[PDB]
Design a protein around this ligand. Structure first.
Ligand SMILES: [Mg+2]
Ligand SMILES: [Mg+2]
Ligand SMILES: [Mg+2]
Ligand SMILES: [Mg+2]
Ligand SMILES: [Mg+2]
Ligand SMILES: [Mg+2]
Ligand SMILES: [Mg+2]
Ligand SMILES: [Mg+2]
Ligand SMILES: [Mg+2]
Ligand SMILES: [Mg+2]
Ligand SMILES: [Mg+2]
Ligand code: NA
Ligand code: NA
Lengths: 96, 169, 178, 148, 221
RNA sequence: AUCGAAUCGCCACCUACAAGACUGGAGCUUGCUCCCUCGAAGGCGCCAAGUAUAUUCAUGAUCACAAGACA
RNA sequence: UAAGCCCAAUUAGUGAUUGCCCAUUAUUCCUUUGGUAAGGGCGGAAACAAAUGGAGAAAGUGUAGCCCUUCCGAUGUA
RNA sequence: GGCCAGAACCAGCCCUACUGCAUUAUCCUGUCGGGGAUCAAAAUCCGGCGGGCAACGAAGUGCAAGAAUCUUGGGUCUUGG
């Protein structure tokens, strides 16, 4: 395997044309750590402080003919502990 | 009874670029292929269709195999098969699917309030009827315990506990 | 699906020389995937019949013969193939199709499945449309009935590709995983 | 012909026109519907305010990549939109709910004209209810196949 | 399985309500064994929690004798020097399906065992699954779309009963009682079902007229 | 009680059954015609408890794990 | 109703000639290194204190390579 | 701020959209005769003659050079600003 690129399957996206609609969308993987560490708006919004963490990526291209998508994460690679776990595919950047 | 594949049989295209269009069998090549044509549809000129891609309908026009284009048009108009087909529920559903596919966000909102409004009024009607003849879980259970509760609550001891603790409120 | 072989007409001759200043011109009928295969089949025919090599000849035309209008017809395909065990085997077969190319393409598939014959071991002698009254095989003649009707049974109808689902509720059409 | 250094330069897509009803995709008011009022100069962010009475969305600037601009629109020629300037959204620098009176007055005036504009527009009652509805991604939804 | 006292104490301190994970329940009756296993194995690797019922009604192509001999050839494979810790041949139809799924997973990795441990198999439909929700099927693994109906096929329970499975009669008796109980319950609640049907039909005359036209446009009236 | 977490569709209408060589019901002519509920939707849920007379939302300042989640 | 064999296609009698997946290969971009390497610059142009544009510029095989541009090759037991 | 992130624009690449020229005739039509099968026809089929563009997105046939500026496509966390 080459871990710099990840494969994400999205519900109701089962065609290559369906997967092309999501090219460029921002992708987020949400997990939690053991301790509360720094986050966005740590001082602005103290309610956001949590063990919850997110890794952010983007859809680069479709994969195959069945709506599979290729996702590249920001800088690093997604952990292998995320295999089989939930991936969030947002609707921005919007093209509509 | 299933509708046979025969000359003059009306079919609906299942998949492909002509999906959900109606044509007439006109001729049978072999066990796998036919020659569909529909004069009233622009994209439905005479062409070959695989029998796995057609759905026979309950209407058959009276044409011979390899009938002329004029003869098919006259038979299609005289039999009124297209007019009859358009009044069925499945034909309406196909039109409904096309309307939803090209719908906008505003029309999707309009359908949402239309279905919610019907849902609200169905509950109003159901609850009014459930009051007369109990059919739900709460109204049937309430009826099942009214007779026992009335018998037990009508005792002198129960009535003393009625007022002595209601007055505290 | 459209036929995988096209009807080609190749016209060619031996290149003129001192010995043969006015060479004969030959017209060739062949069903090939492309015109390069059509030209290859033409020079093979020229070599084994007229003793003329491609290096000593030229092609006058390699056009495609257009199909007629699509009508359900009976096609009589005269075809032959080579096997090591039995040499050359020539047969005459009847097919139901809408074009000459479709009938010949269906003939190649038939020979490939019932006799394991590939394209380059097969020669098509002739193909023609014949009337219903000259059809001998009952498997073909059964399609000439004036009132031919049959139901569609044991049919696997797949959903549209966009609407296909993995898990569906048992007696409904609601997709659970799709 | 419009110079890039000029403040009127814009590469905004035609769907994000003033008056278009947009779905807010990100931020505090995600899932709400708002009306696009204008685009700030120098190809700046859009300014949207779905009437704060209808959905609670105030006069706020938003990047055009974080909205879905729907085809259903509202006539905004009657709404001024002139006093919505970039300097309205700036803040003084600090060192080491509350709404300014100028901001509150701007919201009250803009929303009054915006609400009036919606009423005149045919199917104005439906569009007012449309501006109240919350957009959510449901199980089984396929927004990639939808038309907006 | 049985919750610990610490786990119960923590839940009461948290004050949470009853929790059920999102579980897909598949009715495996008249499903091709291999095609159902391949589809389920991929879904397990994608993080789905799957429970399969009526495993005794799975189907394999071919005559029962041919598939019985196939199992008996598998049964004869055992470590000669020590049959313990040898291949363990499970006779129950639910364990046969589980073994089929296991061979379609990377069973010797932690990720593969996480997928395998997310699958629960049953013979028939046990009471804890009856009322959990509607059952699903796998359209691409169903017998009537996969086999040509002329070819003989075997039912997994019939094959398993003659190679060592001892609970064929117990499952049949339990399944008979379940269907009678479900039929009696479904024979009841008919009045409730028709009451809501008339409420939806009568509600058309009470809603605003323009809302009815919208319903008719999208084929809901 | 540490404990901050990842999870994001509810139901007391699906949560009963069986068959795809034929399961809405008839006729005789056995593949056509006729009747019907017309044979291609489990119901809800998506921001006024319902389609209207309405009503707090900001400064959480342009994305950031939804800053919240007993529907 | 193969996930078997023979043949034949690329979303299919619709409207034309690239379905998809994997390399230390190909193309291209960045960096290194070595050339049978290919070229430019090297007579300080002029002006300019701090408190509040900068620095360098070696006639050179090889260095922290005088600097810059360009092209090609790069695995390997004895 | 030499940190993180998002949007803008540039230059360069990489992608996709929008297509013209040529060619059909063993072809397209009408009509006459034959032949065919029908309750009777028609059609599949073969000849004679007369017309011709099968032109709907005609053909899945040879070659296509269509400035993504017009008419604001996409990517570049695969480059540098
Ligand atoms: Mg079947
Ligand atoms: Mg180099
Ligand atoms: Mg000087
Ligand atoms: Mg030196
Ligand atoms: Mg070396
Ligand atoms: Mg003639
Ligand atoms: Mg002529
Ligand atoms: Mg094509
Ligand atoms: Mg162009
Ligand atoms: Mg660019
Ligand atoms: Mg860049
Ligand atoms: Na060098
Ligand atoms: Na004649």
């Amino acid at each position: 395997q080459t871990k710099q690129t990840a494969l994400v399957r999205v519900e109701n996206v089962n065609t290559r044309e369906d997967a092309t609609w999501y090219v460029g969308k921002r992708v987020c993987y949400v997990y939690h750590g053991k301790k509360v560490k720094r986050c966005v708006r740590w001082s602005k919004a103290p309610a956001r402080r949590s063990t919850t963490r997110a890794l952010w990526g983007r859809v680069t291209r479709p994969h195959g003919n069945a709506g599979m998508m290729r996702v590249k994460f920001n800088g690093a690679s997604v952990p292998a502990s995320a295999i089989g776990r939930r991936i969030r595919v947002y609707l921005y950047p919007s093209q509509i | 009874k299933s509708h046979y594949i025969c000359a003059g049989r009306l079919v609906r295209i299942l998949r492909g670029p002509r999906q959900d269009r109606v044509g007439v069998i006109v001729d049978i090549v072999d066990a796998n292929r036919v020659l569909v044509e529909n004069p009233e549809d622009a994209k439905m000129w005479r062409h070959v269709q695989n029998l796995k891609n057609v759905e026979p309908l309950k209407y058959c026009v009276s044409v011979s195999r390899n009938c002329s284009a004029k003869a098919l048009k006259d038979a299609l108009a005289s039999s009124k098969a297209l007019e009859k087909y358009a009044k069925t529920r499945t034909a309406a559903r196909v039109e409904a699917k096309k309307a939803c596919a090209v719908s906008t966000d505003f029309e999707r909102y309009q359908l949402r309030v239309a279905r919610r409004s019907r849902a609200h009024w169905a509950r109003k009607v159901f609850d009014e009827k459930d009051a007369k003849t109990p059919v739900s879980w709460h109204k049937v259970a309430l009826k099942k315990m009214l007779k026992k509760a009335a018998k037990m609550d009508s005792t002198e001891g129960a009535k003393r506990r009625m007022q002595k603790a209601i007055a505290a409120r | 699906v459209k036929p995988h072989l096209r009807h080609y007409q190749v016209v060619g001759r031996e290149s003129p020389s001192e010995k043969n200043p006015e060479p004969t011109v030959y017209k060739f009928e062949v069903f090939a995937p492309n015109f390069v295969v059509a030209k290859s089949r033409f020079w093979r025919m020229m070599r084994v019949k007229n003793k003329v090599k491609a290096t000593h000849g030229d092609v006058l035309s390699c056009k495609v013969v257009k199909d007629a209008k699509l009508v359900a017809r009976n096609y009589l395909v005269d075809i032959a193939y080579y096997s090591q065990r039995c040499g050359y085997t020539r047969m005459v077969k009847e097919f139901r199709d809408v074009s000459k190319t479709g009938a010949v393409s269906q003939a190649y598939h038939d020979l490939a499945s019932r006799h394991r014959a590939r394209y380059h071991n097969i020669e098509v002698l002739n193909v023609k449309s014949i009337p219903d009254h000259e059809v001998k095989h009952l498997s073909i003649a059964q399609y000439h009935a004036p009132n031919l009707s049959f139901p569609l049974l044991q049919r696997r109808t797949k959903a549209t590709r966009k609407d296909r689902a993995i898990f569906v509720k048992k007696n409904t059409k609601r997709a659970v995983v799709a | 012909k419009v110079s890039r250094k000029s403040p009127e330069y814009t590469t905004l897509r035609k769907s994000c026109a003033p008056g278009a009803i947009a779905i807010i995709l990100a931020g505090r008011f995600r899932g709400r519907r708002a009306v696009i009022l204008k685009q700030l100069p120098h190809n700046g962010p859009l300014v949207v305010s779905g009437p704060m009475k209808y959905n609670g969305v105030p006069i706020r600037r938003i990047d055009s990549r974080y909205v879905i601009a729907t085809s259903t629109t509202v006539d905004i020629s009657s709404v001024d939109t002139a006093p919505i300037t970039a300097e309205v959204f700036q803040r003084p620098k600090a060192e080491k709910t509350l709404v300014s009176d100028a901001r509150a007055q701007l919201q009250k005036k803009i929303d009054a004209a915006l609400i009036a504009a919606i009423k005149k527009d045919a199917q104005g009652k439906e569009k007012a209810g449309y501006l109240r509805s919350v957009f959510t991604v449901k199980p089984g939804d396929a927004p990639h196949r939808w038309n907006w | 399985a049985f919750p610990s006292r610490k786990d119960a104490f923590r839940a009461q301190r948290k004050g949470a309500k009853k929790h059920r994970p999102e579980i897909i329940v598949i009715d495996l009756k008249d499903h091709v064994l291999g095609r159902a296993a391949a589809v389920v194995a991929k879904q397990l690797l994608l993080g789905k929690k799957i429970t399969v019922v009526r495993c005794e009604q799975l189907n394999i192509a071919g005559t029962e004798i041919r598939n019985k001999i196939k199992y008996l050839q598998y049964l004869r494979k055992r470590k000669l020097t020590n049959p313990t810790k040898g291949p363990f041949h499970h006779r129950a139809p639910s364990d046969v399906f589980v073994r089929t799924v296991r061979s379609m997973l990377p069973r010797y990795t932690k990720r593969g065992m996480k997928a395998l441990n997310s699958l629960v198999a049953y013979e028939g439909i046990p009471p804890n699954v009856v009322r959990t929700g509607g059952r699903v099927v796998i359209p691409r693994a169903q017998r009537h779309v996969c086999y040509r109906s002329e070819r003989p096929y075997t039912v997994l329970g019939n094959m398993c009963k003659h190679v060592g499975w001892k609970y064929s009669d117990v499952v049949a008796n339990l399944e008979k009682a379940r269907v009678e109980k479900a039929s009696r319950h479904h024979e009841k609640q008919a009045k409730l079902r028709d009451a809501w049907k008339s409420a939806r039909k009568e509600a058309l005359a009470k809603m605003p007229k323009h809302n009815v036209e919208v319903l008719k446009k999208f084929g809901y009236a």
